């Protein structure tokens, strides 16, 4: 009946292998009860035990098919070998990690030229740091302190990132309610409007422009033909700097090393991040024109004026190197692609069955799947009650429609084990992100699913 | 030429094991050069190819003592084994890392269980981020959000992170200076001031206050004799949330496993990362009173409102259980109390042998030392007297700057040390290393530093 020390407290629950009802205790109370709740509303209230390549496995054991992918950081799948040696090494070789501003760190020099290398433009300079929105608020300092103007225009539907900074460009409500006031002189440019983003990038205190070869989180929308590069000129008519968000669209996911490939975009400030940790080490980059950076940071005051704790050390850089190489070695651009192409033309063909799926967008492996559904005791009642009904049943309407959606993924994790989700700025595109080591089979195993779902709601839409 | 394809050119680098002299090169050429520069100025330009505990070794095998320790990310070393094989032991299972937002992570839960059994005051939930400035950037959203005012009180000397929220509260104009305008709403508070700050809190506009228990980049104060628990008592009377940084004081650096503890503050939220990481893998946390959750995110539409990518993945999860447990297991918060309280003597009695050496401030393992023709002007344009006037004045400060980076270059140079100087002030050399550090490590410093401490004085004649 005495208490434990806390040692022998951590030592019991590090490990102990938990009951996937104790699991789903834990994060209950301690870190998101709405979130276990959505889950086991969802009946996806899984607890994953292992991960490899393409599958997830519970604590039964059972296999899942993973299209989320991590919302885009396992471009490798889950585990990959390669990925992890190089990591383990490192290690064993006791390389020195968290050093990069008391030393010059020799790995994190490695990635940096070989991003810039890489890189279109002509990218001389590289900040590291340790997720996407952190990369993002890198970019923005570098528009802030190069051009000396605060302002920075964006695309509606944007998504840049969660920290404050990356929110005030952040073109979705949803995200941006709760904490306004955002930063000043940022401006919001209707999407695939160029005369409109002419008036936004004239302006006086506008030094920038951040865009996303694809807009991911916001529905999966190639931008129209001409667009990119007329944007691209446009900003060079204007003197803003164009800085590209490839933390999504890039390494590969869309068929392209660089999503900028598919239009000779020549960005000046470029983003990276998700799939550079190859799923195992977080890792941002923001990479920039070398005579940006000087008009930044070129200064003894200013040299250090944007720095990470964490950003650039050995490790991270290790392994992503690592990854890198395992996408080209692997020829997953290619793959991504190829592979593509068949998936988005096999799912067509299924939904171009059913009015419900209007329509599957996207390029490579990036796709998304979007849908489209759906007397005197009144006379007086007060006009308050009134309209306040009135507006509940269309907000409902509404949500009718993403509760629709909702339901393939359901089905897709209950009846088919696959994973699937739905992206966070519109709630009525599926996301479809693959691994990209994804296999035919795989890819033919989800149409078919998919199928099935399809044969279902019709059906489910026609006891009605 | 021709140029080589992709693979190759990456596998060469890869494969390539680079000089020293190759590795500046490329540094200075695709990262920072004035850093670079620096570098080779204060002759500490090193090229790390090992490390291990408070030791890091070079191209050649030559040892240097580590007062840095990662700027705070590495309590337990470099390289410390078993957090090191935790690491390689779930990449070995296969674990799933990057699950957290299409499942329920075991890993990270274990991790929110026990940070809030070991927090103070009354924790319940977290948020798992990859750094420091996210953590805060998540207290600002919380705050934010459960109180729906949007202003965020701070204080004088702070630092709480680079990227553009917290920022916007941290009260240090050569961190800020070319960003503005920063966020709308924050106030800052000078510090120490109990009547500045009730005064700001009262405001209607403020919902929170953020605080350091030792203000890091700012010196290494220890805050006033009753003031910390003075705010908290304000806050309390004025109903605005509490909430500590200990991204740096945390995890046993004062000499308490939360710098909280010396003053039994009970925040609404806390921060933590850096040492979090044992030295591995970047993490953040951000924990919160549970009630304090349900009011900013406890909804259908908020309750995702704040998320990251790779934020509460199992495998940073792993590493920061592993490296709490290691803390925990080798007494070494008591060590660094018992430690830091004998390092402190002792650089007390070499200082006050000095006079350009004025103080040592800190606790446990968070030290700090401080350190102290007639017409032709005449007929000079007036813009021309003031700007030379202004300059020359503007030295006045850097030759002090430069004569605390001299003791610097000493350490490094001579002697093989590693010290800094804090990110805000310029003349208070860090002494902040892993708290695994040993009573002869320490004495090792110590003369060292008496050694430095002496040619200076005598090059302080002539
Ligand atoms: C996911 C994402 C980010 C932010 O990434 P985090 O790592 O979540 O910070 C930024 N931009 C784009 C385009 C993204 O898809
Ligand atoms: C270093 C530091 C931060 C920022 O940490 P990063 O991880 O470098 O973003 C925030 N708060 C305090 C008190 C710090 O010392
Ligand atoms: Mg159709
Ligand atoms: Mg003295």
Redesign the pocket.
């Known amino acids: 009946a005495l208490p434990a020390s806390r040692l022998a407290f951590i030592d019991a629950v590090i490990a102990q292998t938990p009951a996937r009802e104790d699991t789903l205790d834990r994060y209950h109370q301690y870190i998101n009860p709405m979130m276990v709740d959505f889950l086991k509303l969802q009946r996806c209230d899984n607890v994953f035990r292992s991960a490899a390549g393409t599958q997830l496995y519970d604590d039964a054991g059972e296999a899942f098919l993973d299209m989320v992918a991590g919302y885009g950081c396992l471009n490798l799948g889950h585990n990959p070998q390669p990925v992890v040696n190089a990591l383990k090494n490192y290690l064993d070789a006791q390389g020195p990690n968290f050093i990069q501003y008391i030393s010059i760190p020799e790995q994190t020099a490695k990635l940096a030229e070989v991003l810039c290398r890489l890189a279109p433009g002509n990218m001389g300079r590289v900040f590291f740091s340790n997720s996407g929105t952190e990369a993002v608020e890198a970019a923005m300092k570098i528009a802030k302190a190069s051009t000396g103007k605060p302002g920075i225009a964006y695309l509606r539907n944007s998504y840049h990132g969660k920290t404050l900074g990356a929110l005030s460009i952040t073109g979705r409500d949803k995200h941006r309610r709760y904490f306004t006031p955002l930063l000043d002189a940022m401006v919001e440019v209707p999407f695939g409007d160029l005369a409109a983003l002419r008036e936004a990038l004239n302006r006086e205190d506008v030094g920038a422009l951040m865009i996303e070869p694809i807009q991911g989180e916001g529905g999966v929308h190639i931008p129209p033909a001409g667009y990119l590069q007329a944007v691209q000129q446009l900003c060079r008519e204007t003197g803003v700097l164009l800085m590209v968000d490839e933390v999504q669209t890039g390494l590969g996911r869309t068929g392209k090393l660089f999503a900028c490939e598919w239009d000779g975009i020549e960005p000046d400030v470029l983003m990276l991040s998700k799939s550079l940790s190859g799923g195992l080490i977080p890792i941002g980059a923001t990479l920039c024109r070398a005579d940006l950076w000087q008009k930044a940071y070129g200064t003894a005051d200013r040299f250090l004026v944007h720095?990470?704790?964490?950003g650039g050390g050995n490790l991270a850089s290790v392994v992503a190197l690592s990854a890198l190489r395992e996408i080209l070695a692997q020829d997953l651009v290619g793959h991504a692609e190829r592979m593509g192409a068949y998936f988005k033309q096999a799912l067509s063909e299924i939904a171009a069955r059913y009015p419900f799926v209007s329509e599957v967008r996207g390029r490579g492996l990036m796709l998304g799947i979007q849908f489209d559904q759906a007397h005197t005791t009144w006379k007086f009642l007060p006009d308050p009650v009134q309209a306040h009904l009135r507006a509940a049943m269309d907000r409902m309407e509404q949500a009718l429609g993403e509760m629709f959606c909702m339901k393939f993924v359901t089905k897709l994790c209950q009846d088919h084990k696959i994973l699937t989700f739905i992206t966070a700025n519109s709630s009525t595109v599926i996301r479809i992100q693959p691994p990209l080591i994804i296999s035919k089979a795989e890819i033919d195993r989800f149409v078919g699913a998919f199928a099935t779902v399809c044969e279902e709601l019709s059906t489910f839409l026609d006891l009605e």
Request: proline share 0%.
């Open positions: 720095s990470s704790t964490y």
